[PDB]
Amino acid sequence: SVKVVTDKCTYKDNELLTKYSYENAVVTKTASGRFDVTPTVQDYVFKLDLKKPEKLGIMLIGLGGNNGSTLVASVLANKHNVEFQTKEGVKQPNYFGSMTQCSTLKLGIDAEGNDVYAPFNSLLPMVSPNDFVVSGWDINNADLYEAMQRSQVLEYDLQQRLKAKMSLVKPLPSIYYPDFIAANQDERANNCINLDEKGNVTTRGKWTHLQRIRRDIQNFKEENALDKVIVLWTANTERYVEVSPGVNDTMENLLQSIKNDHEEIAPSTIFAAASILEGVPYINGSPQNTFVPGLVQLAEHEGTFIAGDDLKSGQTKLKSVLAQFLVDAGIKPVSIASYNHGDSKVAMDEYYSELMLGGHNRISIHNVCEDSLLATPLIIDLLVMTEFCTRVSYKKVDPVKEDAGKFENFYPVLTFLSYWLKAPLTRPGFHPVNGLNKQRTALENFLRLLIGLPSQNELRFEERLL
Amino acid sequence: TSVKVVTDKCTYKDNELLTKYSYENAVVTKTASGRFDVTPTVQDYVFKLDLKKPEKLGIMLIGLGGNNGSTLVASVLANKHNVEFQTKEGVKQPNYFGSMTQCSTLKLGIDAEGNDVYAPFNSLLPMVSPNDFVVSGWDINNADLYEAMQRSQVLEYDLQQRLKAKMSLVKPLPSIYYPDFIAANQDERANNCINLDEKGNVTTRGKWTHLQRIRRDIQNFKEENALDKVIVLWTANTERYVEVSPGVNDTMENLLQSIKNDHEEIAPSTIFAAASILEGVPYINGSPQNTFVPGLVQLAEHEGTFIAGDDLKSGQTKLKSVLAQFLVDAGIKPVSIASYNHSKVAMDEYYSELMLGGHNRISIHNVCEDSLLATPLIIDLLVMTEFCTRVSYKKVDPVKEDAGKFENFYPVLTFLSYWLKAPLTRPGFHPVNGLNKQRTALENFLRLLIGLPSQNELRFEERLL
Amino acid sequence: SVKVVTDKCTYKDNELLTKYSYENAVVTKTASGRFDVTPTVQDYVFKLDLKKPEKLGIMLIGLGGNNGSTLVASVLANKHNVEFQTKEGVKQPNYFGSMTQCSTLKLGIDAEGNDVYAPFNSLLPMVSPNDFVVSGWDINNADLYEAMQRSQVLEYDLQQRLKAKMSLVKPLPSIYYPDFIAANQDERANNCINLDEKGNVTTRGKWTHLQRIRRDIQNFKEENALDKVIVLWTANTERYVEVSPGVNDTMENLLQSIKNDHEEIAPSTIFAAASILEGVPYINGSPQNTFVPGLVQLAEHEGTFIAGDDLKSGQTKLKSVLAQFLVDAGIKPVSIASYNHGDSKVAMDEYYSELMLGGHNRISIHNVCEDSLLATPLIIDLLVMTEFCTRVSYKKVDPVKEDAGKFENFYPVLTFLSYWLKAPLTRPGFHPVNGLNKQRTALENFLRLLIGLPSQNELRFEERLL
Amino acid sequence: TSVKVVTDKCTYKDNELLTKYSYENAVVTKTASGRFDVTPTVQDYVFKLDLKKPEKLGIMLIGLGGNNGSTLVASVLANKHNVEFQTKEGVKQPNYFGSMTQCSTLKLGIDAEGNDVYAPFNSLLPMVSPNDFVVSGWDINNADLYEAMQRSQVLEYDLQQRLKAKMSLVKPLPSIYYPDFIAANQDERANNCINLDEKGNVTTRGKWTHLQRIRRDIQNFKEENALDKVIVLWTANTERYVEVSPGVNDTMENLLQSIKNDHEEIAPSTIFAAASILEGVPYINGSPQNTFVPGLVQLAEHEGTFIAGDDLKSGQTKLKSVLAQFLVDAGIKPVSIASYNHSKVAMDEYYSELMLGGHNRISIHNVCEDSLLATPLIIDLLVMTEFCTRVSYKKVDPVKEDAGKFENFYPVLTFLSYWLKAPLTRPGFHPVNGLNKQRTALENFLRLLIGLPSQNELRFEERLL
Ligand SMILES: NC(=O)c1ccc[n+]([C@@H]2O[C@H](COP(=O)([O-])OP(=O)(O)OC[C@H]3O[C@@H](n4cnc5c(N)ncnc54)[C@H](O)[C@@H]3O)[C@@H](O)[C@H]2O)c1
Ligand SMILES: NC(=O)c1ccc[n+]([C@@H]2O[C@H](COP(=O)([O-])OP(=O)(O)OC[C@H]3O[C@@H](n4cnc5c(N)ncnc54)[C@H](O)[C@@H]3O)[C@@H](O)[C@H]2O)c1
Ligand SMILES: NC(=O)c1ccc[n+]([C@@H]2O[C@H](COP(=O)([O-])OP(=O)(O)OC[C@H]3O[C@@H](n4cnc5c(N)ncnc54)[C@H](O)[C@@H]3O)[C@@H](O)[C@H]2O)c1
């Protein structure tokens, strides 16, 4: 734990109230060249619900896949201390690869002026992956032990020690329309709600599917005595949907198209619409425009969290880091080749860059690891961060009128999660932000701010000029 | 390209800028158990930034005839005269690619729809461009720079030919040669030394006279070229480390004595360094090795002369550190990092532990003639230590303050840490390193200087209602 | 030069006559397991025309491409000693990358028993690349200097020193049918014979095209006072052709389809048919079935050399070497990934192989170089070897009837060149042979044999048992 | 799987095969200028191949408790008992992958339509399978093989558990420990040594008695297990080279003396070697280092005992050599070859010159636990030196001959050169190396043995009319 001697924070009824001065700057560029930078300010009073649910309910769509199954296993492994045998000895479970669970943040310096970091989840209170209550859907009924089997991600022994328990977790029938599977459809569709009472699939009753899914969420909520719940798409990858004026452009139409069983309405569209109606945060972990404007509207209306559009591969991450550092130092990357072979894949991206005076630079990144062992911890983080956000709200403080604010909620598309997605969906007029490093500080500073610490600046003036 | 920020923390006398900045930080004290107590600290300053930048800057390179050196001189003339050159891939315009000061940009703020607005790194305040450099220097080998550029087979053939007329005119000054000190990094023979005895043969006797010639040398260069501001940078061999002792190189009085006693522990490096200090020309040691022993540092603190320190980041070590960092910022536990090193080639193998017995292996293979990397880095280094020389700071206590009298940066330019592998320092402070962070320093200091907050990445305008 | 004290070789009228005992073995496999190996023998009298043309005429189709232009330049560079300046100093021309010009062969041992090799072209007399007289076609009229320019393969300076001369080499109009360009069509078709007298291309007059091409070869032959000529396809890569019963299955039909301007008749088909009619060796350096059965028939009839089906990339070569060595040692390659970005390309093939006891082996090959600098010397070799073959003929000697042989010519599809092609076309009932190493020895032994030396055996008994 | 070639160069007495072979070769003498004069040479032999192969072969490993050793013993039992094991990728049948004798094939001839016919490498003649091995050995560490296999974290966990009952029963014999000789390769402490003085502490005194215990040890193993044929292979540490001198290890008389004088230059290796010779058991040195000094070689020539020599090819050095060779067989001029080396990882960078100033860069990155590579290689080594032990040759002069009396192979099994990085030899002959070639030797010798020509790749049946 950490606590800061500051006057900008007061603990109410198990609620942190923080005043933050939001400095920024507007700049215009003159039809000549010159940039005119007009600074900016806007104080805020942030309210952090200080009580983390004791048990967070999670509902994975594609719960039978490599990521879903290893997610459940990672929770069971850590919660129950189930150590497993390995070719390299006996090993304790952990959560390596997770930012919430294993990375740290700088708090400040010490007597001698040397940096001092603390667990990324030590500052403010966050829910533990170990307190996750998972279940979900999957268009295939294998159970999670059998799921762990076909994925071949975990160690034989480990898989064995979780068998008894994971043979018990059974995914619910999901909704499966055939024309939308654009890929990542490893298993057969033998567990579906959507069956014309004869036995077939069919794309009819799309609204009834939505209701079924909504009811699903409600029942799951009670069977576990859970208040907060969070759904997340980790299934196959579908075909993008053609947003057309009248079907999925505005709220009114989206819902409407569903009842009509419009064809542009896809499985994820429903799970998303359902999640939203139940006011439960929905995360799109796969590439695809499930979040058409129409659905987005709905979210804005219900005032319920959404995020997503691809889990950030540990390769598409490392590609960002590398390419940025490059431009940041003045090199002009002029070419970018590729590789890529779930579990145990090989990635290789090569950069042919320009140096000064006709020179060139050839950089090659070779990457091998089991995908899911990276995608899973990253899923843990998303869930853990959209949980914390859901408990934060802010207030716009007017400098010449004490206490002029009615506490509001994070604009719906939590862009704060971007660090973990490839295509950061975004508010209507903004250009998305990538660049792992920037995306992380944003999060680090947000957390600094809530406990009253300033934006990290690294100027370290207590040495650069004594 | 110019930048004008509408603030009030900035007052412009005339060719003298005063800026008010509030340095927020924190001290923490974890104690008994796992609880960190942070006490935020503030300390106000007023930064004076002398707006007058030298129209011509003198750059004196030790190792002028080597790979870095010849290509430095080459890129100056080539960029300055827009001398295009032919290649198999077509005609090519010279540039300064690989220079942070010259080719990278910065985010100042946003615009009408939220999208960031970037601007040239050298646009903000006012900096000396490399095109207006005038360079000379020393080297233990007399070959002029057409030949040197010829040896250092780094530049395209045609380009070396369009530059032959001008580069031939440049010849390094005789240097100081103490054979036992040359650990490594000398690809060329020594036929240009000032330390010749009363018989013409390389001596280690008379080091103080060697020190004087270097000053005479520094003085002459400024005189013969107008130039008032001049900076020396060692880019020569890498000598064998010197052993730090008492009564020799510990103080500022017996380092001057030691030199006079022709005592050992005084490497060519030491002399050049001290000579640079004694003339108020900041000195940059771009190669690994002590040099900046304790004694020397004093001499520079006194006299008020800046000094940048120890070695200069490779374009793979400045990629190793960021690759490793990225990993550790995602919760991955590197277990092993192995490094190749060699156009030349570098390889780094990272085996880091994943979750539940899983493992990940990343392989970074890097290829390029690193002088095209080291050179733009040398420029940056020079431009930046120049800027830092027109900036004095004022430590203010808001309810009194420091009743006027600015201070130059603590001699050691630990701002230049983005360009040196072994960031020099002053006692007790654990060296930093952290490219991303280190660069974030220069951006923030370039910002506050003109009244800018120091960037956060919260985008409340977008994430907040 | 080399000369061997042996009784199996006699020099006639500037003609080597060699007796060779061709040992081999037939084996059947019993419906049980056992292999019954019935050895074999068949003596031969080989006749080698000992006089190499003073000037060999070469006609490249795609003479304007990266390979064609750098081929001409490599000949001009070496013949005229034109040294060029480089970033690394002044360099003399050479023929690195060529087996005929730069590799060696073991002849035998010495006083102390240490191996002794000799230039691969020192044994018997072969024509020098420096004595090549090149010209050819290209569906684009840039001249070869301009050709050298757009390819960017050679050093600026070198390109400059060959400018005067190469601005003089101008490719002839070629035949260009649009529907056959499946790829590698970097330049525009502005130099074609096939133009309906109006100005367009059209696919009519296919036979007249053949005649034009034949006449082309004849004129080239005389304008240079050349006897021997060799055409080679080094142009774009076309669409495979559908061999159908009646158009290109037998000779009679092929020729026929041409007159008919059948659509299955493609540009390479004609250059090939023409080459054959003129009895000049035709080499197919690109992937594509230009050699349909019908064309093959024709070759068999005229008794004229053919070979080809892709130039062997220095990567598809290195892939063979590696994969073989692997199986040869018992490893079971189970996977093979890929890369590939002419000039300056990057290849990367990765092998995931199985070791004993569930173990695995991960091998990755990364390759970067300018393609053409490898493809060109390899083109030199093909030309140099199909030239030598063209001067060899053999005789079947019957062991119980002195001198029963009428000297014959190499079966038409010189499979001896395979070492340099990817898809080694082959005689009707045989399964092609790859495996660079085997493919090379075959050539080494053939040459050994002609000068009377036995098949290399490496048993080195003068030490393994004294 | 059996092979029966219809020839007449092969006569089968009964469990004794005689083969007639004509060894064609050539001597050449380049002289004045560039002209090679080759004079073809012939020398006829009769090869006797004792058809009786041991039903059980004793394998004594020095270093039995190490990585190679435990996995050797493991693969024997696992293959022999068809003990399948579980993995994340499913249940897996044990095998002998990586063994040339066990899993690679050969071309004997063609068939009805020209297409080659391949057959198992161990099908031709008759060889001892690894499944019928009986292994014991020494190691300076007493840990039994369940534990050893446990340390050497090379085998899958489940597989180590299905083999725990049997591997626990096996414990290495006490070895010989001379601390100063251990250059490197000892990952484990020494708590199992026979060279303890009259007080129980490791001595270097009494080397001859150490030599005797090794024989007693060899004798016992054969007795206690029936076995008549037994082969020892050093797969222990790699010791510091020994210095060759006069009156100590030069002859066969003062190497026996030296040992008795407890003289130095006698490494544990030397003793094991000599002990193996003195019992007629062939000895295989699978690690770099002299050992096979000159003296020792004599002792083995005498006594008629085979000896395989120096180190054992890595699965990357046995890929470096072939990669380089391939390049040089295409006319490319390697200029630089750089080697990494580390499951473990290896990297090789080849920069070779192309035509007209062009350059090519090949990068070979290799990964795998190399014991799964070294182990099958050890098997092969053993199977093959066994075969070579049932083959005597007869040097015949066709118009007289050698009026009967075969000869064993010259002690040094330079046939095993495909498996050893530093192919040992006898004076004057420049070491060979050339994987492809070296393997082509074994194929040709396996061929002639049964009356086959020795393969050419001319395919006159296809290329000839
Ligand atoms: N960034 C990374 O490193 C990384 C790695 C692996 C997967 N991913 C992402 O995760 C997704 C797949 O994850 P995975 O590794 O478990 O793959 P997977 O191949 O196991 O597929 C996920 C599971 O989803 C189920 N599914 C498919 N369609 C469904 C539907 N309409 N409704 C409910 N369940 C459905 C499948 O049966 C399967 O078991 C992909 O979208 C992919 O982009 C990212
Ligand atoms: N660590 C890095 O990434 C990095 C990158 C670039 C340069 N450097 C530093 O730059 C220096 C040389 O680098 P380079 O690429 O130009 O190599 P280089 O091969 O051109 O050698 C430097 C030049 O200095 C001259 N010289 C040698 N000893 C001298 C002496 N005692 N006094 C004066 N001149 C001397 C040489 O003749 C040569 O021309 C070294 O100090 C090196 O450590 C380090
Ligand atoms: N193995 C290797 O490393 C390697 C490398 C490069 C090219 N190749 C082979 O060579 C061929 C192309 O060679 P390149 O490197 O010169 O490429 P390129 O891109 O320069 O194309 C060859 C030339 O052929 C000409 N051409 C195209 N179609 C023609 C036609 N119908 N008639 C006459 N000329 C025609 C083009 O205009 C071009 O200039 C391809 O088939 C390719 O497979 C192999």
Ligand SMILES: NC(=O)c1ccc[n+]([C@@H]2O[C@H](COP(=O)([O-])OP(=O)(O)OC[C@H]3O[C@@H](n4cnc5c(N)ncnc54)[C@H](O)[C@@H]3O)[C@@H](O)[C@H]2O)c1
């Ligand atoms: N060059 C190669 O590619 C290659 C490949 C495989 C093995 N080798 C050789 O095999 C040996 C070990 O290889 P490994 O992979 O099994 O390693 P390892 O780490 O298992 O060590 C060998 C074993 O020998 C034992 N040992 C050490 N010193 C000894 C001594 N003086 N007398 C008896 N036993 C002793 C050790 O305790 C250990 O169990 C070395 O000699 C090595 O050079 C070389």
